Amino acid sequence: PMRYADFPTLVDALDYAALSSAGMNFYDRRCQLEDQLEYQTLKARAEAGAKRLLSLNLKKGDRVALIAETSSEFVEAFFACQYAGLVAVPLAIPMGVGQRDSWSAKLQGLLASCQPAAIITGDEWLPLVNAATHDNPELHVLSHAWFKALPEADVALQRPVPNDIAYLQYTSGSTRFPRGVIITHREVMANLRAISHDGIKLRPGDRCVSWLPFYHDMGLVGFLLTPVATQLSVDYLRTQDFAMRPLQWLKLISKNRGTVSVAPPFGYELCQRRVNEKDLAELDLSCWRVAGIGAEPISAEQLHQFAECFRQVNFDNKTFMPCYGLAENALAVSFSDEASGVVVNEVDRDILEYQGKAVAPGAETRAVSTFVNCGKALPEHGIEIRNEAGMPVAERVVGHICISGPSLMSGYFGDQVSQDEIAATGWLDTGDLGYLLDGYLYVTGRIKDLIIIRGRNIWPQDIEYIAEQEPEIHSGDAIAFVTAQEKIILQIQCRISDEERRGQLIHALAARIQSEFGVTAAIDLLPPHSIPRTSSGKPARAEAKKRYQKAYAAS
Ligand SMILES: CCCCCCCCCCCC(=O)OP(=O)(O)OC[C@H]1O[C@@H](n2cnc3c(N)ncnc32)[C@H](O)[C@@H]1O
Numbered sequence: 320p321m322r323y324a325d326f327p328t329l330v331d332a333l334d335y336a337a338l339s340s341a342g343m344n345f346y347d348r349r350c351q352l353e354d355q356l357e358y359q360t361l362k363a364r365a366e367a368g369a370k371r372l373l374s375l376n377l378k379k380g381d382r383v384a385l386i387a388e389t390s391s392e393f394v395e396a397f398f399a400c401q402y403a404g405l406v407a408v409p410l411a412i413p414m415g416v417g418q419r420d421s422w423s424a425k426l427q428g429l430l431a432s433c434q435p436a437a438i439i440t441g442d443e444w445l446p447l448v449n450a451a452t453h454d455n456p457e458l459h460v461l462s463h464a465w466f467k468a469l470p471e472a473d474v475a476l477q478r479p480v481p482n483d484i485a486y487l488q489y490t491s492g493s494t495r496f497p498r499g500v501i502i503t504h505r506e507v508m509a510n511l512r513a514i515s516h517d518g519i520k521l522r523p524g525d526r527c528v529s530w531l532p533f534y535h536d537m538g539l540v541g542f543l544l545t546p547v548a549t550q551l552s553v554d555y556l557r558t559q560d561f562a563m564r565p566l567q568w569l570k571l572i573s574k575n576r577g578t579v580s581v582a583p584p585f586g587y588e589l590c591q592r593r594v595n596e597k598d599l600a601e602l603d604l605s606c607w608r609v610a611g612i613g614a615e616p617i618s619a620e621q622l623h624q625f626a627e628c629f630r631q632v633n634f635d636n637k638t639f640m641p642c643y644g645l646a647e648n649a650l651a652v653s654f655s656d657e658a659s660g661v662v663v664n665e666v667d668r669d670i671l672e673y674q675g676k677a678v679a680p681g682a683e684t685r686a687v688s689t690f691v692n693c694g695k696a697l698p699e700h701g702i703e704i705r706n707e708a709g710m711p712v713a714e715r716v717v718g719h720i721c722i723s724g725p726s727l728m729s730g731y732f733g734d735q736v737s738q739d740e741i742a743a744t745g746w747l748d749t750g751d752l753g754y755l756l757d758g759y760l761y762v763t764g765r766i767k768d769l770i771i772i773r774g775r776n777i778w779p780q781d782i783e784y785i786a787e788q789e790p791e792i793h794s795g796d797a798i799a800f801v802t803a804q805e806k807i808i809l810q811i812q813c814r815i816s817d818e819e820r821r822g823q824l825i826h827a828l829a830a831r832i833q834s835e836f837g838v839t840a841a842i843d844l845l846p847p848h849s850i851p852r853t854s855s856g857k858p859a860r861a862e863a864k865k866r867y868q869k870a871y872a873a874s
Contacts, residue, residue: 324514426496526578578607584615645751783797810840810845855869
């Protein structure tokens with residue numbers, strides 16, 4: 320009997336789901352069931368774990384760092400935290416090895432920011448953990464085995480209340496400035512309620528499919544918590560397994576008649592880029608009811624490519640649902656209409672760059688940007704476009720996207736200023752640029768990423784697009800930003816070995832951009848993969864901008 324995130328507390332939520340027959344299903348890279356976890360069972364393992372955790376003399380409010388793998392182990396640990404009233408803090412594994420020194424610097428800052436009293440990890444990362452917590456004595460380091468091996472602290476489990484902290488979301492900080500989003504039970508529930516009942520609009524019989532990491536915002540709140548608060552089943556792939564065989568995602572959907580799934584723009588592009596007939600041989604995608612896109616500025620153009628690619632296996636493009644969100648609001652902020660397909664608004668590009676206004680292309684329009692409709696505000700939540708000064712602007716005026724309502728965070732963990740402002744105004748400036756049209760939000764990009772030169776602004780992605788036209792360059796391979804000396808740099812990480820082609824493409828690209836944009840850009844060909852992402856899994860444009868700046872000061 321379905322309930323739409325109805326509950327006060329995540330523990331309440333799960334208590335109800337342990338009464339269903341649904342659960343999670345972990346699949347290997349060949350879509351083979353590798354491990355299963357029923358909610359009924361999850362509740363038990365969570366209660367027991369909650370008591371084990373307490374035997375460690377950990378007090379309510381205390382933080383427990385989890386190494387967020389896509390695993391039955393991690394899920395249990397996470398709810399074990401909720402039930403034990405401890406604050407869960409999901410951390411990302413190492414981006415590999417060789418980046419494993421990058422990781423430790425990151426990890427130590429995470430620890431300085433929230434002082435976890437314990438950290439549960441899988442064996443694989445156990446060495447690394449110990450080698451990195453080298454100088455945090457006050458930290459218990461538990462393998463999942465040692466953790467499962469603990470004694471039930473003989474105590475009566477206290478039920479959590481709405482205003483308790485449920486978990487901290489760290490994707491929001493840099494390696495230099497770690498920021499922790501505080502999410503209370505009330506807040507994560509408000510959003511879960513919004514998503515299930517108002518945004519996505521789930522139905523009985525729906526079934527989710529995710530390949531997203533639990534360490535990112537989307538994967539976790541959208542795909543661990545939402546199937547739990549909705550008593551709906553879900554199937555996971557590992558994020559790395561998808562990266563290597565994209566089509567295994569569509570496979571999984573078609574295999575179990577999957578219904579709902581959401582990925583970033585590139586998740587969709589990766590697929591259509593690397594599909595082959597052998598792959599289309601299994602696929603039937605009529606069951607796919609809602610295909611969501613968000614996390615980064617959506618490319619209408621791509622999504623069209625993808626839909627065109629999979630019409631033949633029954634992908635309905637009307638199932639597309641562009642949506643918008645951030646961690647600072649738990650997850651979701653807006654969703655495109657039900658059964659909408661991608662809806663776009665075209666604008667005179669020059670009017671946007673020069674006058675910061677979204678107007679419709681006229682007879683004299685010479686350039687056009689396309690923005691994707693990301694929906695209207697959710698029930699009880701507000702979305703407002705404000706300018707520099709903090710004053711609300713009209714429709715079609717681009718400015719700072721500001722949000723408010725129950726989902727809003729409490730502030731950054733430890734940050735008094737952040738909590739004070741939110742407590743005072745009830746509004747948060749997301750640091751994203753956009754505008755409204757007939758109440759729908761159009762997200763154009765991050766204020767941080769915007770290329771600001773004399774008297775006009777350019778959207779870095781409009782320039783990077785020109786680079787992605789080349790066969791060798793893909794989306795994300797190219798980063799654009801403006802140096803502090805007002806010189807525009809375009810960095811491109813690529814596998815082009817031929818020295819003749821390098822020179823050829825650099826010269827062609829320079830020209831093509833000075834034609835299109837009236838700006839001369841410095842093409843920087845880098846090695847792959849030489850530019851990596853931020854903690855939220857997007858292109859670190861701003862980070863690359865300073866790396867370059869700091870570098871250039873060595874002159
Ligand atoms: C079953 C239910 C599933 C529910 C699906 C949930 C839908 C939520 C969508 C993703 C949540 C998220 O990505 O978190 P994060 O803090 O890491 O990134 C935060 C930042 O991302 C950028 N940004 C996200 N969207 C964008 C978009 N459309 N256009 C342009 N910029 C977008 C922003 O500048 C933003 O402030």
